[PDB]
């Protein structure tokens, strides 16, 4: 399972490219929301599991 099966172009402002590392590891907007504004359902969930791995420095709910 790809998360980007579930990216979410439509509303988010990162490109399919700058996606997953942007959501999960630049601490400058990631976190939950971030997530919530690029990724739905097992992608959303695959997200939180990265941006929220052990620690980061994300900003989860």
């Known amino acids: ?5 579930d990216y979410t172009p439509l ?3 990162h490109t399919i490219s700058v996606v997953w ?5 630049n601490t ?3 976190g ?3 997530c919530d504004s690029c990724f739905e359902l097992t992608g959303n969930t695959m997200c939180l ?13």
Do not use: I, K, V
């Open 1 to 5: 399972y790809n998360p980007e099966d």
């Open 21 to 25: 590392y942007e959501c999960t590891e």
């Open 28 to 30: 400058a907007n990631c």
């Open 49 to 61: 599991l990265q941006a929220g791995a052990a620690g980061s420095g994300c900003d989860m709910e």
């Open 32 to 34: 939950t929301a971030c």
């Open 11 to 13: 509303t988010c402002p």
